Design a protein around this ligand. Structure first.
Ligand SMILES: OC[C@@H](O)[C@@H](O)[C@H](O)[C@@H](O)CO
Ligand SMILES: OC[C@@H](O)[C@@H](O)[C@H](O)[C@@H](O)CO
Ligand SMILES: OC[C@@H](O)[C@@H](O)[C@H](O)[C@@H](O)CO
Ligand SMILES: OC[C@@H](O)[C@@H](O)[C@H](O)[C@@H](O)CO
Lengths: 257, 257, 256, 256
C-alpha cells in the first residue's frame, strides 16, 4: 500500500502490545518507526524482529529530558518527525475510598502529562520543519464514561480526549492533525492485568472478567491490536488531512460516539 | 490501491455532489457502483463520465417500491450488494415559529425514512447473501448539536446518528458494519443553497455566509468532497471491520466528537 | 409555592409521569391543562387533582387539535406559561422487522407532536410577551441507540436535537426550552416495554423490568416522583439561565 | 427551607461562585464551612453571611489540610452532609508554551483537589451512614477543548469523568455525586480569564468579556446567582435519583 512512504514516526510505549502492532503496520506502509519504550531491551528486540525501518529509543514520557532526547534521537536517525503516536499508558483500578495519591500521581504522570509533553515536543519539531504532521493520541472507552472502580484511569483518558481537542485546534494552523483512537477491550498482556484487578475487587476467578467483557462486545469478541492498525495508518495518512480534534472509537460497538 | 476490489456498492443521491465523488472514489478502488438518484438523466451522465464500473439507477428513497427496485437492480447488474452509502438528503432552514409541516414531512421522509428503509432493504439483501456488508450513513455537524434556524435538518441528522447506532448494534451479528460520516461545511451546489437560506433569514448578502463559515473552520477552509472520500473508502474497507455504530466527524475541527 | 399563578399544559398527562407532573405543578400553585387524547382519563385525572387542573382533549399528531388545546388553555387560564411535551408512544422491533407503520406512528407523536406543540406554545408565549418554560420529555433511549429500539431511540434523539434548536431560537423571547431524560421508570409504559422485550429476547414477562431496575446504579427502577423535582425546577425562576439542555434523571443509567 | 439542618463544606468559598453558594445554602437552613486557603477572606465572608457560616483554612492540594478541614466540619457542625468542590485555578497558554508548572498547578487544585476532598468527604459520609450530596464544579471548558486552554479544559474534562466514576461507586452509600458546568460567569475569575485572552488574542482588556457575554444565546455573561438554584437543587431531596450527571447552567453556551 505504502500510505506512509518515507514518513518518520515515533510511537511511545511500543516495545509490545498495541504500540508494537502499530510500529509493524507503519513499517509495512513504508514509514521509519522509532520504537520508544522505557524497556529498551524489549524495544531493541521488537525493532530487530520488525526490520531495518524500525529502531529502538529509550524513553520515559514522565521526564522532560527523556521526551526531548527521544525527539532528538528521531530527528538524528530519521531526519525529522512526521507521525507521533502517544501509546504509553498505565492502568490501575480501585474504589473511590481506596484510591492512593501514588495511583493518581503515576497514572496522570504517564497517561496525561506523558501524552501532553510528548505531543508538545513533537509539535515544536513539526513546526520547526514546516511540513505538517500527524499526532495520534490513544484514548479508550474508559475516557468516554466513568466506571465505579476505574476513576483514575477513566479520568486520564477523559483528559486525553480533551487534550486531543485542544491541541488539534491549536496545531491545525501548522498542518498538524491531532486526533485520537479509543479502543474497546483489547486482548493481550494489558487485559490480563485489568482482569486480575477486577478478579480481586469484584470477587471473581482470574480470567472471568476478560471472558465476560469479550462476550459483551456487540461485534462478538474481544479486540486484537490488528483491529486497530487500519485506523492508526488512516489517521497518519493524507486521506485524514481534513480530520481535526477527533476521538474515533474502534471497539466493536463497545461505545458509540 | 483497490481496497474495494470486486465489491458491489449503491450510493443514494449520487448523480451529483458528495455522493458522486464517493461513486468516483469507490470505482477507482475497484468497486462496481450503482449511481442512484431521483434524477436518472444526471445519474446516467455521471455513470458515463465515471466509466463502465458505474451504472445509473432511478431511485426515490421516499418510496418503498423504488427502494426495493434499486436493491434488485443492484443484484441483477452486480450479482449482489456489499456497500450501501445513504447519501440522499434534503436541506431546509426556518426559525421555530416559521417551520412548516411540509418542511418537516419532506426532510424527515428523505433524511430519516429514506435512510432507515434503504438501510433495511440493503440489510435484508446482505443477510440473504451471508457475506456481511458495509453501510455508511451520511450524518452532519447539524446532527451533533442544534441551531436556532435549522431545527428540522439538525433533528433529521440527529435521528441519523441514532439510527446509525441502533442498526449497527442489530446488524453486526451478520457482519454488517453500520457507521456514519458527519461532514462540516462542504463547498458546492449544496452550500450555495444553504447560503441563500441564511442570506434571507440573517439578512446578509448572498455568499457572505459561505465565506464566514469556511473561514471559521479550524482547518481554515470550507470542505471539499475529496476531504471525505478517504473516510468513505475506509468505512467500506476490511480495515474498518471492528468499527461499529460510530459517527466520525470529517469536518476540519468544526465539531469535536 | 414555586409555580404560583402559572398556567401549564402537559401533553399526555391523564396517566403516569405526565399525571405525576400535573399533580406536582398544582401543589406548587400552577393551573394545569391535563391534555390527553383520552378525554375520559384526563377528566378523571383533573377531578382527582382538584380545581386547578382541567381536562383538554388533544391529539398532538393533528395541527387543528394542537391549536385548539393552546386556545382552550388561553380561554381557561388567561394564557400559557409552561408547556411539558410528555405525550409519547413506545415500540420495539429489530431493523429487518421495522414497519413503515411503526416509524410513522412514533415519529408523528414523539417528534412532530413535540415540535408543533412547542411551536404553538412558542407563538402564544411570544404574543403574551412574558416569557415561558418549555420542557420536552427525552429518554435515556435518545442518548444512545439499541439493537431492538431503533425507531423509539431515533424519536428521542430527535427530541434532544429539537430541544437544542428551539432553546437557541426562543431564548431571545425569555422562553427556556430544556428536556428531561428519564431512564427506566416503573409504570404502565414499562409494562408495555417489558412485554415487547419478553417476545424479542425470549424472556418471561417481568424479567426485563427486573433486570433493568437492578442494573440502575442507584439500585431500583425509577418512579414519576423521582422526576417531579426537576420538572418543577425547569419551569421555575431558579432555571432562568438554563437553556437548550437535556438533563438525565435516571439513577446513573446514562451519564451526560 | 430546603437544606434545613444540613452541614455543608464549600472549597474556595471566600469569594465568587463558592461564596454565593455559601450564602444561598445558609439562606436554605444549612450550616456552611467557608473553606479557603485565605483564612482572612473566609473569616470576613463567614462574619458577613452570619452565625450559620464559619471559616476553615484549607489547601485542597494538601492531604493533611483536606482531612483537618473535614474534621473541623465534624467538630463544628457534628457531621458533613453536602460537599461543593468549588476551589479551582484558571490558566491559559498555547500548546507550545504550556509549562509543567501550569500543568502541575492546575491539576493539583482542579483534579487532585476535587478528587481527594471528594474521597475525604465520602469516607466521612459513609461512616455517618446517612448518605450525602457531593457537587463538583465542572465548566463549559470541561465539555470541549479550546486552542489556548488545553490545561484548564483537561482539568474540567477530568472533573466530569471523576464525577461519573465517583457517582457510580458512592450511590450504594446514598451519596449523590453530580457536577455543575457554568459557562462564562462575571467576577474576579473572568477578569483574570479576559486578561490572559487579551495577551494571546491581542485584544484590549475587557473585549473578550464583552464578546463572550454577547455570544451567550441567553444574551449576557452569567452571574453566581444564575447557579444557586441548581447548587441548592443538587444538594436537596428532589435530586435523590440524580446520579453521575454534569448539568450545564450557562445560558446555552454548551448543549449537553
Ligand atoms: O483498556 C481499559 C479497559 O478496556 C477497561 O477500563 C474497561 O473500560 C473497563 O475497565 C471494564 O470492561
Ligand atoms: O450541511 C449542513 C450545514 O453544514 C449547515 O447546516 C451548518 O451546520 C450550519 O447550518 C451553520 O454553518
Ligand atoms: O422509556 C424507554 C426505556 O427506558 C427503554 O427504551 C430502555 O432505554 C431500554 O429499551 C431497555 O432497558
Ligand atoms: O471559566 C471558564 C471560562 O468560561 C473559559 O475557559 C471559556 O470556556 C473560554 O475559555 C472562553 O470563551
Amino acid at each position: 500500500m505504502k500510505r506512509l512512504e518515507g514518513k518518520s514516526a515515533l510511537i511511545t510505549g511500543s516495545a509490545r502490545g498495541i504500540g508494537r502492532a502499530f510500529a509493524e503496520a507503519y513499517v509495512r506502509e513504508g514509514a521509519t518507526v522509532a520504537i520508544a519504550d522505557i524497556d529498551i531491551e524489549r524495544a531493541r528486540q521488537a525493532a530487530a524482529e520488525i526490520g531495518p525501518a524500525a529502531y529502538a529509543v529509550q524513553m520515559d514520557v514522565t521526564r522532560q529530558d527523556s521526551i526531548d532526547a527521544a525527539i532528538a534521537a528521531t530527528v538524528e536517525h530519521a531526519g525529522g518527525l512526521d507521525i507521533l503516536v502517544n501509546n504509553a499508558a498505565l492502568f490501575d483500578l480501585a474504589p473511590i475510598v481506596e484510591i492512593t495519591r501514588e495511583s493518581y500521581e503515576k497514572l496522570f504522570a504517564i497517561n496525561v502529562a506523558g501524552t501532553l509533553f510528548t505531543l508538545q515536543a513533537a509539535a515544536r519539531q513539526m513546526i520547526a520543519q514546516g511540513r505538517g504532521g500527524k499526532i495520534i493520541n490513544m484514548a479508550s472507552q474508559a475516557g468516554r464514561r466513568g466506571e465505579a472502580l476505574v476513576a483514575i484511569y477513566c479520568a486520564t483518558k477523559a483528559a486525553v480526549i480533551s487534550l486531543t481537542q485542544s491541541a488539534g485546534l491549536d496545531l491545525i494552523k501548522h498542518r498538524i492533525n491531532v486526533n485520537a483512537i479509543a479502543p474497546g477491550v483489547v486482548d493481550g498482556e494489558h487485559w490480563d492485568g485489568v482482569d486480575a484487578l477486577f478478579a480481586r475487587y469484584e470477587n471473581r476467578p482470574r480470567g472471568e472478567k476478560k471472558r465476560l467483557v469479550g462476550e459483551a462486545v456487540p461485534f462478538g469478541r474481544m479486540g486484537t491490536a490488528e483491529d486497530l492498525t487500519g485506523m492508526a495508518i488512516f489517521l497518519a495518512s493524507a486521506e485524514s488531512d481534513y480530520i481535526v480534534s477527533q476521538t474515533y472509537n474502534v471497539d466493536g460497538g463497545n461505545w458509540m460516539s
